[PDB]
Amino acid sequence: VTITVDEYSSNPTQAFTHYNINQSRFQPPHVHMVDPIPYDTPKPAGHTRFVCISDTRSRTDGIQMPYGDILLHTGDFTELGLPSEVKKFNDWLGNLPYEYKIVIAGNHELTFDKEFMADLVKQDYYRFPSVSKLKPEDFDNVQSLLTNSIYLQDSEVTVKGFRIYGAPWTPWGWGFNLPRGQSLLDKWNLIPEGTDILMTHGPPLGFRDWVPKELQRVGCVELLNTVQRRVRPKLHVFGGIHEGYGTMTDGYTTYINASTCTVSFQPTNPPIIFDLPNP
Numbered sequence: 001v002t003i004t005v006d007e008y009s010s011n012p013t014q015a016f017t018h019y020n021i022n023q024s025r026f027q028p029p030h031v032h033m034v035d036p037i038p039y040d041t042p043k044p045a046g047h048t049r050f051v052c053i054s055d056t057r058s059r060t061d062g063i064q065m066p067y068g069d070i071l072l073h074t075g076d077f078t079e080l081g082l083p084s085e086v087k088k089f090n091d092w093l094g095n096l097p098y099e100y101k102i103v104i105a106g107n108h109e110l111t112f113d114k115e116f117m118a119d120l121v122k123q124d125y126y127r128f129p130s131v132s133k134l135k136p137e138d139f140d141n142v143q144s145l146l147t148n149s150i151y152l153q154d155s156e157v158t159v160k161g162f163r164i165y166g167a168p169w170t171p172w173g174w175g176f177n178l179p180r181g182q183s184l185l186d187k188w189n190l191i192p193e194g195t196d197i198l199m200t201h202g203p204p205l206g207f208r209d210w211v212p213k214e215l216q217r218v219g220c221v222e223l224l225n226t227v228q229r230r231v232r233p234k235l236h237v238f239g240g241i242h243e244g245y246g247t248m249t250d251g252y253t254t255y256i257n258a259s260t261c262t263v264s265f266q267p268t269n270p271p272i273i274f275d276l277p278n279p
């Protein structure tokens, strides 16, 4: 299956309506919300429990973390990507019991986006003064500070037989933003067939990507087409759009918006647990 740029790529709200009108792509019965399960739910035999969080934004003190096997964090684990914030997050990870902790970057991890960092100091450096102060040596090893994680960036890991792929890019003045269309499709084309769990920082079109204040959809159209038509992971986890915290299905893939922080800037949305059968 070859994904090409959608005719509605640049206009996600119109893409949503187009596909809903013609194909009922976002309609019941197959597309619907999925209620969360409480942390005392027994894990089914032969399954692994994923604990999904995102957009913790250095506010990890006091998050009540549930029993599970593998943590998935879908980015914005810092405010600015400062090396000290990355260290604090890594320290928090090392105290969690989970066998594996898988992490991707998001928009706030400015120091992880080498193009952003190179551009910032040549332009309006005073838009991010604490970041602009950093010397090249201060952030050349930033991802290496995540010693308690497996860090993914357009890359994958097989853990307990699960194929997990992660990428930070979003279609939205922050890090890891790319123009809608081919620029993002080039990234999504890297996701392999056979991926069980896809981690991206933001949503695909139509799944937990409505922004009330803007009355628009903001998910990536190319990512949706890739997920449903080519890759078909069992789980697509993401954050970014805090208003969309919660879970949906399309009948095959489960979509989890794991945004921990709310529009009130507090990390009060509970971690979401999700069980998958072992390969």
Ligand SMILES: [Ca+2]
Binding pocket: 136, 137, 138, 139, 140, 141
């Ligand atoms: Ca260094």
Ligand SMILES: [Ca+2]
Binding pocket: 055, 056, 057, 059, 260, 261, 262, 265, 266, 267, 268
């Ligand atoms: Ca918060």
